[PDB]
From Swiss-Prot, chain A:
Belongs to the eukaryotic ribosomal protein eS24 family. It is found in: Cytoplasm. Its main location: cytoplasm. Component of the small ribosomal subunit. Mature ribosomes consist of a small (40S) and a large (60S) subunit. One of its GO terms (biological process) is methylation. This is Small ribosomal subunit protein eS24. Keywords: Cytoplasm, Methyltransferase, Ribonucleoprotein, Ribosomal protein, Transferase. GO terms for cellular component: cytoplasm; ribonucleoprotein complex; ribosome. Disulfide bonds: none annotated. It comes from the Eukaryota.
Length: 92, 145, 159, 204, 100, 96, 232, 74
RNA sequence: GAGAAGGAGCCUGAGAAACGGCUACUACAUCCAAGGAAGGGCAGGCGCGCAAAUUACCCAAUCCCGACACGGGGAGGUAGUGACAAUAAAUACUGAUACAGGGCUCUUUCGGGUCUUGUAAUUGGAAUGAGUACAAUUUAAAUCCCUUAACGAGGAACAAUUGGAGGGCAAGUCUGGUGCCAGCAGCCGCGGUAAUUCCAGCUCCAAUAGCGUAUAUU
């Protein structure tokens, strides 16, 4: 259930904020990235509609999962800067 | 992690039961086990170890004892530390070298030799036979960061 | 070659392996090693190639703890054999470290993944061990010996 | 050397018995048996085949349906009903036999029965198998495993390295067109009937 | 020169080498124990993966065939934790460097 | 023989089914015709109730003999496209 | 459609960028004397991630190369071109290392406003007008008359006018932009004419290593006068 | 309302000769043959088998023949 | 390097003597209402009547072209088959009780050797992957992997084979011969198929996820 965000970059010119996001569910089942976007709306004080996470490789032996969360300054910035398949995976 | 009160990770590599561990404000460890005479500097979030083996090397020569076990550790700064072995050995070490920087034997001297009165139940107490004293060695260590 | 027959059988029986395939395979490993030993004797003493390559190979062998920390010379490098390679074979460590009553029970345990070395559980009983790791072998948390769930038979008997 | 050995092995397999041919210069329409279990859509295969060959949807195709597919030759497609008796009829007739197999169900007894009777009375020219109703599978691993095992069993029953095509769904209520197309591709590339003494001595 | 590199790495260099932990470098349920060089290669793969934090396709068929070909043609065997070269021209390089 | 390992043949006309004793080699001989030349040679079948499988004018494949009519050379492995030991372990029946 | 292995080695690229490398568009700089802008931003400076990412960032007017916005993705940025990005507000110059590979200097507008461009050729154009062609293929109408070949010129880059010049001088620190000893910072100490073609100079470093380099591939930077701040 | 096939025709063994557990696992068969051979060895030569009994010595618990020499004559 | 049915001539463009086109000649060859009219590629399957690797999917990444942020890309990468090899490895673990008394081995054999072994006995324990699988993830989308909740071994089953040696037989069959013999072997017997439950699943040996046989032969 616990999280860390190493290697965070502002990306001001792409208007996006990039953290190497490590999420750890010890003994819990897998993650539900949409719930992760909900949680990271709160974790970095945003809304769920301008955040998008991909990557999401759970390590060997369960628990830790490495993902890549992208926080845009606007959901429209996400719309203009986001990949098509990533948008429809988010549900837009 | 006490913040969520959970287990996060373990580390193995110790041939002995680990006797002592010291730490600092960074994400590292140092951990000594006894009969291997070995300190281990744990690089925690990358999960590596740095092995450090002691090999202990006007008095009777027999009383001088090598590094029997490896009892206490004190991490002083990010790069040096010290070990205390129960044969009275006090050894400053560097991360940068494989070798101890500086060890001193009989850090608390030798033990008092026992009486002939309790060593032998003889009406004649003879010092011709008597064991050599063992080195009064380290039970505990501390340092301030 | 009835001697070949009985010798291979005694190898398996003393260490309860499965077939002469696996036994011949470990013998092939030994053959490559003793080939190395022969070559490094063919170069004469105090030669630099000999010094560094032989020091290397001896460090390799003592790193996997097969050749003893006592004896550290090319003579004993020649003198090693299959019983020693089987000694550092893994399942033997479960039996000689007192978790499984029998070598076969150890084989079954390794199948259903109850022991680990360091972190990860192991399934292959021919995972060679290292001298530096061999004492760090215990049950995993998910196995009822180590804990976790009590098991399916305890589950059904409670049912 | 090894060239000579391999080549004489090749001619060795190139040998058979010397039987006489008796096929007229305008040979009759060679026959395709359609055969499967009950509830298999024997009917559906007939429908989709005749549409691919004739552009004409038959809402209820029965009987011997005869179709040209090359300037040399032509076929009569005919299914068996669900009786062993008509199965033995079309068995003693046949020259090429499509056998259709049910997927998630496994094998049907009449399927193996007919396989046996065709085996005894004679292996004709060509036999192919179509594994069908494949969209009754949630699990890709399950589907691929079933394909593997039924391939192996059908191989040792039929002969080594057989021909077993796959038919995924039922699209318009008709079939998948690409699958039935390359099916027609492999079956229209034709070979002479194989000389069974019955079909080279008598009239039928 | 690799044997020489290992000797100067451990024996004469008064600087201890970082060892990875025991259970981490087990590859697939025990079917692999990671050696130092390709373990470093794994580290290089992961550090590139976190540089641009992109995902990769796991090694494609051509590089797979290539490295398996090098293995099948290669005089090096990964017995346990260690690698084992054969004893031809690398050792002759040792001989040449020592004459130098 | 010849230049290849196996050879093909028709079986011509069985002798030795008039053979009196059950399992004598003069039951188990059979007369094959070598196709590559047209020869008439003499081959074995490894059991009586499988000689029963070899019927006249059914494709028959012969091969060597390695080990009471001493020195017959040939025995028969695949019958009509299926192996003899197969038929006689009753794996797959005979296609003619 | 060339390979990543056929890509030249002075602009760097790892083993994971796919087998192909983009070819640079034609322009002021030469083909093998180019690092494309995408290779700059996302492969060397990693500011974007994808082809379409870099594409979009350049479709919007956010970057200006040498004071002018550039939109084509593979524009030639060969040597000591200044690149401003106003969002971070940082400018970059493109030099070599001692190893002969591309290096990028972060810089502000104070040093970024000018360019030390190497003169290629002076001529007398139509209307008899003297003009100047520099290494950046920039022409200048009516230069100062003293500047002949093998001199460099400090250029305004906003009006683009002459701001200074350094004469070709055996006694001036120079930079190597070609050949087998490419990218070696040292002082011109001698020059041999070799009239008949391919004359050279003798150039020692700061630490007593003399070597013979061709006046074609030489490039002066200043007598001492580090007019562009080399990284320490 | 269909008709299944059986294990037989799914695995056309037919007229194979029948075998045992001991054969069917080639792990087990070299366990027992190793056991019985080691038992077979316990006929000819002499194995060590621990010390004298923990309760004590109890005679040569299976007889002594006098007139039997088991010495290799060198 | 040479070519886009064959020679000859011509046409655009920055770049072609594109093989892109036109024209003639030649040569096929299509439809036709007979007057006309268009047109010439690779891939595949057979190639004896008998045979063995997808007719998968996407431009997601990298790269390329255009009025051009979007469009298109036969590069590229994703997936499927596999005893041709090669790799790791299941098809079981372990008591307790009862009972039986031989089990086995051999130079040297009408003779010796060594001591706990077996039982198709009764029962107790645990252990579980293969299959099955909710999901979540992965991905262009899928799949695989990692995780992972839940089902999930008592033999007659979640059914290991190929190969050779040998033992035992009938109210059965046949070939010899100075009665009982001796051979060959023998799925056949009197009856009997919903009948029979027997060497009750015989013994040995080798390799066992494989292994034989012919031929050439070294």
């Amino acid at each position: 259930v616990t999280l860390r965000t190493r290697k965070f970059i502002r990306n001001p010119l792409l208007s996006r904020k990039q953290m190497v996001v490590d999420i750890l569910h010890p003994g819990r089942p897998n993650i539900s990235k949409d719930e992760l976007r909900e949680k990271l709306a709160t974790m970095y004080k945003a809304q769920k509609d301008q955040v998008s996470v991909f990557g999401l490789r759970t390590q060997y032996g369960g628990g830790k999962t490495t993902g890549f969360a992208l926080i845009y300054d606007s959901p429209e910035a996400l719309k203009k800067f986001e990949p098509r398949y990533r948008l429809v995976r988010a549900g837009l | 992690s006490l913040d969520e009160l959970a287990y996060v990770e373990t580390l193995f590599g110790h041939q002995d039961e680990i006797l002592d561990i010291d730490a600092l404000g960074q994400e590292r460890c140092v951990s000594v086990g006894a009969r291997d005479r070995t300190a281990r500097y744990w690089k925690v979030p990358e999960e590596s170890q740095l092995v450090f083996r002691g090999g202990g090397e006007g008095m009777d020569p027999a009383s001088a004892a090598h590094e029997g076990s490896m009892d206490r550790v004190a991490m002083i700064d990010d790069d040096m530390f010290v070990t205390g072995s129960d044969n009275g050995d006090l050894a400053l070490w560097s991360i940068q070298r494989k070798k101890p920087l500086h060890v001193i034997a009989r850090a608390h001297g030798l033990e008092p030799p026992i009486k002939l009165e309790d060593y032998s139940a003889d009406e004649i107490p003879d010092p011709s036979i008597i064991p050599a004293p063992q080195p009064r060695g380290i039970t505990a260590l501390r340092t301030l960061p | 070659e009835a001697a070949r027959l009985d010798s291979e059988l005694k190898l398996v029986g003393e260490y309860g392996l499965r077939n002469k395939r696996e036994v011949w395979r470990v013998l092939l490993t030994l053959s490559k090693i003793r080939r190395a030993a022969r070559i490094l004797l063919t170069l004469d003493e105090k030669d630099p190639k000999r010094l560094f390559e032989g020091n290397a190979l001896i460090r390799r062998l003592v790193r996997i703890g097969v050749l003893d920390e006592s004896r550290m010379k090319l003579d004993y490098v020649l003198a090693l054999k299959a019983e020693d390679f089987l000694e550092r074979r893994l399942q033997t460590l479960v039996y000689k470290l007192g978790l499984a009553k029998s070598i076969h029970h150890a084989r079954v345990l390794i199948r259903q993944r109850h022991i680990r070395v360091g972190k990860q559980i192991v399934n292959v009983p021919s995972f060679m061990v290292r001298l530096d790791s061999q004492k760090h072998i215990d049950f995993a948390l998910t196995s009822p010996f180590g804990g976790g769930r009590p098991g399916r038979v305890r589950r059904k008997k409670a049912k | 050397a090894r060239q000579a050995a391999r080549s004489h092995d090749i001619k060795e397999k190139r040998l058979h018995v010397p039987l006489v041919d008796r096929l007229p210069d305008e040979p009759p329409p060679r026959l395709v048996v359609i055969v499967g279990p009950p509830g298999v859509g024997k009917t559906t295969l007939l429908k989709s085949l005749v549409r691919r060959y004739t552009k004409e949807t038959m809402s209820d195709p029965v009987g011997p349906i005869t179709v040209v597919t090359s300037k040399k030759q032509r076929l009569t497609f005919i299914e068996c009903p669900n009786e062993l008796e008509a199965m033995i009829d079309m068995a003693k007739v046949a020259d090429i036999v499509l056998l259709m197999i049910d997927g998630n169900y496994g094998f049907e007894m009449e399927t193996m029965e007919f396989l046996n009777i065709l085996a005894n009375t004679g292996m004709p020219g060509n036999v192919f198998g179509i594994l069908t109703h494949l969209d009754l599978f949630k699990k890709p691993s399950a589907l691929k495993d079933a394909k593997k095992r039924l391939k192996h069993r059908l191989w040792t029953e039929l002969y080594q390295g057989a021909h077993l095509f796959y038919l995924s769904g039922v699209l318009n209520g008709r079939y998948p067109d690409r699958e039935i197309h390359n099916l027609s591709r492999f079956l229209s590339v034709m070979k002479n009937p194989r000389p069974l003494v019955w079909r080279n001595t008598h009239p039928y | 020169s690799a044997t020489l590199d290992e000797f100067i790495a451990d024996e004469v260099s008064t600087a201890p080498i970082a060892e990875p932990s025991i259970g981490t470098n087990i590859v697939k349920r025990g079917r692999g124990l990671k050696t130092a060089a390709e373990r470093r290669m794994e580290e290089e793969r992961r550090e590139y993966e976190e540089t641009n934090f992109v995902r990769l396709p796991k090694e494609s068929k051509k590089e797979r065939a290539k490295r398996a070909r090098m293995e099948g043609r290669s005089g090096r065997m990964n017995f346990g934790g260690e690698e084992f070269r054969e004893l031809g021209e690398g050792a002759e390089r040792i001989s040449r460097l020592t004459k130098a | 023989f010849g230049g290849s390992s196996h050879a093909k043949g028709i079986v011509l006309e069985k002798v030795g089914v008039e053979a009196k004793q059950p399992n004598s080699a003069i039951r188990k001989c059979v007369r094959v015709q070598l196709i590559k030349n047209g020869k008439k040679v003499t081959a074995f079948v490894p059991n009586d109730g499988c000689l029963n499988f070899v019927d006249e004018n059914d494709e028959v494949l012969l091969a060597g003999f390695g080990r009471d009519i001493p020195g017959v050379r040939f025995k028969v492995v695949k019958v009509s496209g299926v192996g003899l030991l197969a038929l006689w372990k009753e794996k797959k029946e005979k296609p003619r | 459609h060339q390979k990543r292995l056929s890509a030249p080695s002075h602009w760097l690229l790892d083993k994971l960028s796919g087998a192909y490398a983009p070819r640079p568009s034609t322009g002021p700089h030469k083909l093998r004397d180019c690092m494309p802008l995408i290779v700059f931003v996302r492969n060397r400076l990693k500011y974007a991630l994808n082809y379409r990412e870099t594409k979009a960032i350049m479709m919007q007017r956010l970057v200006k190369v040498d004071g002018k916005v550039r939109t084509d993705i593979t524009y030639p940025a060969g040597f000591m071109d200044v690149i401003t990005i106003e969002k971070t507000g940082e400018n970059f110059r493109l030099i070599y290392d001692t190893k002969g590979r591309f290096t990028v200097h972060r810089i502000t507008d104070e040093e970024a406003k000018y360019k030390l461009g190497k003169v290629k050729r002076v001529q007398l154009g139509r209307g008899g007008v003297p003009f100047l062609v520099t290494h950046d293929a920039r022409t200048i109408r009516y230069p100062d008359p003293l500047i002949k070949v093998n001199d460099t010129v400090k250029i305004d880059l906003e009006t683009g006018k002459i701001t200074d010049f350094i004469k070709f001088d055996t006694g001036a620190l120079a930079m190597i932009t070609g050949g087998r000893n490419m990218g070696r910072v040292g002082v011109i100490t001698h020059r041999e004419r070799h009239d008949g073609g391919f004359g050279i100079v003798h150039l020692k470093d700061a630490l007593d290593n003399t070597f013979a380099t061709r006046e074609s591939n030489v490039f002066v930077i200043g007598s001492e006068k580090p007019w562009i701040s080399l990284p320490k | 309302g269909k008709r299944q096939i059986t294990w037989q025709i799914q695995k056309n063994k037919g007229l194979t000769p029948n075998r045992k557990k001991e054969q069917r696992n080639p792990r087990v068969k070299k366990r027992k043959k190793y056991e019985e051979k080691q038992k077979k060895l316990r006929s000819v030569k002499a194995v060590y088998k621990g010390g004298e009994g923990p309760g004590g010595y109890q005679g040569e618990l299976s007889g002594i023949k006098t007139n039997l020499v088991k010495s290799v004559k060198l």
